[PDB]
Design a protein around this nucleic acid. Structure first.
Length: 150
RNA sequence: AAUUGAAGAGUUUGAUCAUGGCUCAGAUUGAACGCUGGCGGCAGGCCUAACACAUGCAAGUCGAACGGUAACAGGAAGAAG
């Protein structure tokens, strides 16, 4: 059963001949509690349809992230535009400690305990897609074993 | 057995993305102030002028070193009815 939860929403403008006309945007991630976490982004005229459009778009862009027990295996870097992130396993307990606009995208991954921190400027739109490719670059011992002997 | 450790937001431009400053959520105090006020255990109490200081008390003991007896406590002696 897939989960969902909203992150943020802000207004925009166009300022066309008649005057200022507005629109709304939303962003949301999804996760099944066993890795395999995606996200989406969409806009519409009003929030109740905007969030629905965002979620309906979010069903695409699925990925596959290997996980071990309940903690992430090895550290990983992350870079995109103007934001950088850092992570660390911290096996067992201590829950998850992380800043805002980072908690949700990691929670649905299923990991019940991990330690992480983000560096630099942290606009939420840019910060996402950093943990994504960070998990994409992740390797478990089976893959590296598949290219070197045992 | 003796080192399990990393939370962010607000803020300009009609709206955007950055770089940049400012401020706020913590833990502390040899602490002062405002209001309020039950009990017991511990600990602590001139940073400011090394400014000038009333009055009491904070360094004496040995007669088993010595010449001695100004204040007792007893002791022979003499004057007491």
């Amino acid at each position: 059963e897939l989960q969902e939860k909203l992150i943020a929403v802000n207004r925009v403008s166009k300022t066309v001949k008649g005057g200022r006309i507005f629109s709304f945007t939303a962003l949301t991630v999804v996760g099944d509690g066993n890795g395999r976490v995606g996200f989406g982004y969409g806009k519409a005229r009003e929030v109740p349809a905007a969030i629905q459009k965002a979620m309906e778009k979010a069903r695409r862009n699925m990925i596959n992230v290997a996980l071990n027990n309940g903690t992430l295996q090895h550290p990983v870097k992350g870079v995109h535009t103007g934001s950088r992130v850092f992570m660390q396993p911290a096996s067992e307990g201590t829950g998850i400690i992380a800043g805002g606009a980072m908690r949700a995208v990691l929670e649905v991954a299923g990991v019940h305990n991990v330690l992480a921190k983000a560096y630099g400027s942290t606009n939420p739109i840019n910060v996402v897609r950093a943990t994504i490719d960070g998990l994409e670059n992740m390797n478990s011992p089976e893959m590296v074993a598949a290219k070197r002997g045992k």
